[PDB]
């Protein structure tokens, strides 16, 4: 089986700036006239769409900027003004001998100016403490980079238990994170207590940013 | 045009056979390969059938497991995986002639698990309290254990969009999934604009309108 070897495995990159990712196969994959090596982009949630077959070859719809290069063994494809809606995964595939064969992949991520996340919090609804269950949720939306930590505090003390994190991805248009925590006590413990606050720890600030409420 | 089967839920062990109907050229004529995707994860070759003959030729990974078949009568292939497992969840693709291009069916989801269906509990989110005066309030609802995805949500019966996220589900150690779906709002309008989230789960035909109100303290 021909191995194809993608690297690098993630780029991050500012709009506007170029970049080039390398695929090699374990041999030549020249023949006829032609080098049976295409590139394709899988954006979250979609299926792969051709931009090059060939090794240079440019789908029709496909804009100039991506341009794909090399034969034998060494290809690249190259993405001039880079933008967020970029933002996907690349595979090159060999199509000489079978079985066909992707590339692990090239998850191009893009760079921009740091935000702040915007927290809200929300209490338990009504109709969760009808039954036996109060969560607690907070959404720390539109932010960068994508590290980010978020704490949650019971009457002044953390509660690291029965806690559930999500993060959206890159956004398509700004590039941003999102990301929602959700703490899940009994009825009971929420009862109990009175202070709940997430505090969100991410580089744009010195100091957690900090939401809060009192039952 | 390539127009897959709907989507497939299954019990680990038990099989799943995926419909491919083609039109808009000759079908015995090009090899018709299927490629999976995972959710969040790459594309993945499986096989191909030439539709002429019916010879084929699977990846390592699923020979003796999955089984290409063609009905040249009505242009329509097929694959068949046994022996499913939660790790065949994805979405699955024909594509034609994938080595020289081209054509993919808009793929069919399946979904491998010892969970049943399941329609989501709807909880709100309350209006985020806030200590000082004015500023930007989020709201939700929390769409929490269904069974299987997917879940579509809009607000006010699609008439607020501005502001709106509803994030991907995750799956929970329960074997089902819950999501949220978000809106940032002004403050100054929680007093007089009312919100529903609209949550519809087709795969067990539950439909739920939440409104979405300020706590009583507020």
């Known amino acids: ?215 | 045009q390539l127009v897959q089967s709907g989507a497939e839920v299954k019990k680990p062990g038990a099989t799943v056979k995926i419909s491919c109907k083609v039109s808009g050229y000759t079908f015995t004529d090009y090899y018709i390969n299927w490629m999976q995707q995972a959710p969040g994860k790459g594309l993945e070759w499986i096989g191909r059938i030439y539709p002429g003959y019916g010879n084929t030729k699977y990846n390592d990974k699923f020979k003796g497991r999955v089984t290409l078949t063609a009905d040249t009568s009505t242009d329509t292939a097929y694959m068949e995986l046994s022996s499913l497992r939660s790790e065949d969840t994805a979405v699955y693709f024909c594509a034609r002639s994938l080595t020289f291009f081209d054509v993919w069916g808009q793929g069919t989801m399946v979904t491998v698990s010892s969970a049943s269906t399941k329609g989501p509990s709807v909880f709100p989110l309350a209006p985020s309290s806030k200590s000082t005066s004015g500023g930007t309030a989020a709201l939700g609802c929390l769409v929490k254990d269904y069974f299987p995805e997917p879940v579509t949500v809009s607000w006010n019966s699609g008439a607020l969009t501005s502001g709106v996220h509803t994030f991907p589900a995750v799956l929970q150690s329960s074997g089902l999934y819950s999501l949220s779906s978000v809106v940032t709002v002004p403050s100054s309008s929680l007093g007089t604009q009312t919100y529903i989230c609209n949550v519809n789960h087709k795969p067990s035909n539950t439909k739920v309108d939440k409104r979405v109100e300020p706590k009583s303290c507020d």
């Not at chain 1, 290809?75 to 880079?82: A, E, G």
């Not at chain 1, 000489?96 to 191009?108: A, I, Q, V």
């Not at chain 1, 969560?135 to 003390?157: A, Q, R």
């Not at chain 1, 009994?186 to 969100?200: I, L, M, V």
Request: aromatic share 10%.
């Open chain 1, 1 to 215: 089986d021909i191995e194809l070897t993608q690297s690098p495995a993630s780029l991050a990159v500012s709009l506007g700036q170029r970049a080039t990712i390398s695929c090699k196969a374990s041999q030549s994959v020249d023949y006829d006239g032609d080098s049976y090596m295409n590139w394709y982009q899988q954006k979250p949630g979609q299926p792969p769409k051709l931009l090059i077959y060939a090794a240079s070859n440019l789908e029709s719809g496909i804009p100039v900027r991506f341009s794909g290069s090399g034969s034998g063994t060494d290809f690249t494809l190259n993405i001039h003004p880079v933008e967020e809606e970029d933002a996907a995964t690349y595979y090159c595939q060999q199509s000489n001998e079978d079985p066909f064969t992707f590339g692990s992949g090239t998850k191009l991520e893009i760079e921009r100016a740091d935000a702040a996340p915007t927290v809200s919090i929300f209490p338990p609804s009504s109709e969760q403490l009808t039954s036996g269950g109060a969560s607690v949720v907070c959404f720390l939306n539109n932010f960068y980079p994508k590290d980010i930590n978020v704490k949650w505090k019971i009457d002044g003390s953390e509660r690291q238990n029965g806690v559930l994190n999500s993060w959206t991805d890159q956004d398509s248009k700004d590039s941003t994170y999102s990301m929602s925590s959700t703490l899940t006590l009994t009825k009971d413990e929420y009862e109990r207590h009175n202070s709940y606050t997430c505090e969100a720890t991410h580089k744009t600030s010195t100091s957690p940013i900090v939401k809060s409420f009192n039952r």
